[PDB]
Structures are given as structure tokens and as C-alpha cells.
Amino acid sequence: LALLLDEGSKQLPQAIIIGVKKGGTRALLEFLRVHPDVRAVGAEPHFFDRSYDKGLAWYRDLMPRTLDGQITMEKTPSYFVTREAPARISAMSKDTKLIVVVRDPVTRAISDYTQTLSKRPDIPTFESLTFKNRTAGLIDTSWSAIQIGIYAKHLEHWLRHFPIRQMLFVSGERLISDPAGELGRVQDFLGLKRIITDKHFYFNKTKGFPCLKKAEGSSRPHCLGKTKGRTHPEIDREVVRRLREFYRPFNLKFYQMTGHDFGWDG
Ligand SMILES: CC(=O)N[C@H]1[C@@H](O[C@H]2[C@H](O)[C@@H](O)[C@H](O[C@H]3[C@H](O)[C@@H](NS(=O)(=O)O)[C@@H](O[C@H]4[C@H](O)[C@@H](OS(=O)(=O)O)[C@H](O[C@H]5[C@H](O)[C@@H](NS(=O)(=O)O)[C@@H](O[C@H]6[C@H](O)[C@@H](OS(=O)(=O)O)[C@H](O[C@H]7[C@H](O)[C@@H](NS(=O)(=O)O)[C@@H](O[C@H]8[C@H](O)[C@@H](O)[C@H](Oc9ccc([N+](=O)[O-])cc9)O[C@@H]8C(=O)O)O[C@@H]7COS(=O)(=O)O)O[C@H]6C(=O)O)O[C@@H]5COS(=O)(=O)O)O[C@H]4C(=O)O)O[C@@H]3COS(=O)(=O)O)O[C@@H]2C(=O)O)O[C@H](COS(=O)(=O)O)[C@@H](O)[C@@H]1O
Ligand SMILES: Nc1ncnc2c1ncn2[C@@H]1O[C@H](COP(=O)(O)O)[C@@H](OP(=O)(O)O)[C@H]1O
Ligand code: NA
């Protein structure tokens, strides 16, 4: 009795949020889902890093259906640091657009540690993990929480397979302070009309972050959940200064590669 509509085909994603871990990848994808021309995968696929042997038909079948003109997207934050991922994504399509939501490497590292802490309460201290010798002097650049934050090093690998014009570096800090402004730039990059705007957001004082007045799936207000916007433990103040000192030259190189000063160093 009801009219059942064509929902279109499943397309491979024309744009992927490839990083960074704890940069604000869920927030960005959630906000983009408000747009009538966006369809997104929910959970992180981890195709190009973990499930690549399943093949592209399996990956395609994970995708939402789309009507003509809609963009298909997913986010997997580990892609950015996955050595094989640039070649593999280019093999799917050299024209894929890539979004990297970046964040102050120091708060990104603490966020990453705090995520582990929320699931494993008796992990070692952040300060012990920061140093080779677990006390001072030399920073353990091999520790994942520090290594992920050296964005210029990972970016080099991507630029061997993509032109930088196909990459957008989104400010995780501005995504919080001015979500509508940042989403304006994202919509431009994706070729989307600039529909997501200031009126889609409000500041939730209890959450401490922007929330959506309406989500794609909700007539009611939507904040991200308990795993988003965690209270960080306090980190030793001198350790923080040392980590900021370690990242500064790498940050400046990243500003030079991307053409933008993200403000993490004054
Ligand atoms: C409203 C509306 O509209 N609605 C609508 C819609 O809905 C939708 C929506 O929209 C959306 O939004 C949603 O989404 C969602 C999703 O889905 C979900 N998912 S799930 O899956 O979960 O489900 C979610 O998501 C989220 C979550 O939450 C999270 O979680 S947590 O918890 O974690 O937080 C996630 O996360 C993730 C991340 O991200 C990742 N990253 S990357 O980068 O990787 O990518 C990951 O991470 C992880 C990893 O994995 C790992 O690795 S491995 O390999 O290992 O595995 C890593 O690990 C590491 C760590 O971290 C470290 N640590 S530190 O500290 O350094 O950092 C290390 O660890 C270590 C330590 O250290 C030491 O200590 C230890 O030692 C030991 C141990 C043991 C022993 N014994 O045993 O004896 C001894 C000693 O060790 C350790 C180890 O090793 O382990 O290291 C490690 C490793 O490293 S390397 O590098 O070397 O490798 O990391 C990790 C972490 O975490 O960190 O993954 C993760 C996860 O994991 S698990 O496991 O947990 O699983 O994710 C997130 C995201 O975002 O994604 O949620 C969401 C949402 O949210 S909100 O907010 O937004 O709310 O969805 C939805 C749905 O879909 O439903 O729609 C719908 C539908 O519709 S349609 O139409 O479409 O159909 C509707 O209905 C509605 O209404
Ligand atoms: N509106 C929002 N609500 C909640 N978290 C937001 C947000 N906009 C940005 N974020 C950031 O998104 C981070 C998580 O990034 P990802 O989804 O890539 O793992 C959070 O880390 P914190 O928990 O350290 O605050 C938080 O700072
Ligand atoms: Na973590």
C-alpha cells in the first residue's frame, strides 16, 4: 500500500576523514550528517588499515546508499598514521578527497591517554610514558601518543600519493569555538552548498561543548556522548612545557606544509 522509493546505489566514499585520533573526527562527521547531500557510515570501518583483505566489494557494501549528488563518507582516525593507506586509498580512487581534523599535539596526546584510562584505570602515568627512561630528559617519540602528533611526518606519506589540494586540514580547536565557521570551509572543500550554519548549533553549558539543535536522526537536541569531551587528568606542568618544546619545530613545519598556522605555538 505504501510507495517504496529508490534509495540509490552504494558508492565508494568520495571523501574520507582520515585522521587524527582525538582531533574531533566524530564531531565533524556528525555535523556533516545534517547536510541533505551527505550520507555517512556510523562506526569506524578500519578498512584501509585492518580489514583491507576483505576487499573493496565488502567496503562498498558497508556504505550507505545515496541518491545522485549526495556524497558518501566515513571516518577512521588511524588511516593518517597507516603507512600503506595512502597507496591503497589512491588505488581505490586517485580523486578521493581527504580530511584531517588536527589538534594541538599536546592536548591530543593527553586526550588519547585519557581515552585509554577510561577503559583501563591502572595504566602507567602519562609522565612516565612521555620519556625514554620513564622519568626525564629524552622524549619517547616511539610512544604512540606522541608519534601520532607529529603530523608533518605522516603528511609526507600522503603527499607521495595525493596533491595537497585534495586534502583539508580542519582546526579541531576552531571546530569547538566556531563550528559553523569551520563547517563552512569543509562544505566548500566538499563542493557542498553551505547549509550547515550557526543556527544548527548551540552551546550546552553542562556538556561544555557545542551541540546540535537537531541531528540527522533526531528532532531533538543532540550532544556527543560520554566518550567525547572527557575530563583530562592534570599533567605535570613541567612535562607539558617539555612536550610543547618538543613539538614546536614539527608544528612549524606542518604550518609550512599546509599553509596555515593552527595557533598551537603562539
Ligand atoms: C543522533 C543521530 O542522528 N543518530 C542516528 C545515527 O546514529 C549514528 C551516529 O550518527 C554516529 O555518531 C554513531 O557513532 C558511534 C559509533 O558507531 C560508535 N562505535 S562503536 O564501535 O563503539 O559502537 C562509537 O564510536 C566511538 C567510541 O565510543 C569510541 O570508543 S572509546 O571507548 O574507545 O572511546 C571509539 O574510539 C575508537 C578510536 O577512535 C580508534 N582510534 S584509531 O586511531 O585507532 O582509529 C581506536 O582506538 C583504539 C585502537 O583500536 C587501539 O589499537 S589496538 O591495535 O591496540 O587495538 C589503540 O590502542 C593503543 C592505546 O590507545 C595506547 N594507550 S595510550 O595511553 O598510549 O594512548 C596504548 O595502549 C597500551 C597501554 O598504554 C599500556 O599501558 C597497556 O599495557 C598493558 C596492557 C595489557 C597487559 N596485559 O594484558 O597484561 C599488560 C600491559 O597496553 C596497551 C595496549 O597495547 O593495548 O597502545 C595501544 C596500541 O597502540 S598502537 O599504536 O601501538 O597500536 O587505541 C585505542 C584507543 O581507544 O585509544 O578504537 C577506538 C575504540 O576501541 S575499542 O576497543 O573501545 O572498541 O570510536 C568512537 C568513534 O567516534 O568512532 O560512538 C559513536 C557515537 O559517538 S557520539 O559521541 O557521536 O555519540 O553511530 C550511530 C549509529 O550508527 O548507530 O544513525 C543511526 C543509523 O541510521 S542510519 O540511517 O545510518 O542507518 C540512527 O539510528 C541514529 O538515531
Ligand atoms: N561538539 C563536541 N562535543 C564533544 N567533543 C567534541 C566536540 N567538538 C570537538 N570535540 C572533541 O572531539 C574529541 C574526540 O575526537 P575523536 O572523535 O576524533 O576521537 C574530544 O576529545 P576530548 O575527549 O579530549 O575532549 C573533543 O575535544
Ligand atoms: Na589511547
Author numbering: 141 to 406
Authors' account:
We also obtained the crystal structure of 3-OST-3 bound to PAP and 8-mer 3 at 1.55 Å (ESI†). Notably, the presence of the 6-O-sulfo groups generate additional potential hydrogen interactions between 3-OST-3 and saccharides a, c, and e (ESI†). Surprisingly, the 8-mer 3 binds to the other molecule in the asymmetric unit in a completely different orientation (ESI†). A superposition of the two 3-OST-3 molecules within the asymmetric unit (RMSD 0.48 Å on 252 Cα atoms) reveals the other 8-mer 3 is binding across the cleft in the opposite direction from that of the previous oligosaccharide. However, it is located 7.4 Å away from the phosphorus atom of the 5′ phosphate and not in-line. This binding orientation is likely inconsistent with transfer of the sulfo group to the acceptor site, thereby, it is deemed to represent non-productive binding. A kink in 8-mer 3 is visible due to IdoA2S (saccharide f) being in the 1C4 conformation, as opposed to the 2SO observed in the productive orientation (ESI†).
The enzymes transfer a sulfo group to the 3-OH position of glucosamine in HS. Individual isoforms display substrate selectivity to uniquely sulfated saccharide sequences present in heparan sulfate polysaccharides. Here, we report two ternary crystal structures of heparan sulfate 3-OST isoform 3 (3-OST-3) with PAP (3′-phosphoadenosine 5′-phosphate) and two octasaccharide substrates: non 6-O-sulfated octasaccharide (8-mer 1) and 6-O-sulfated octasaccharide (8-mer 3).
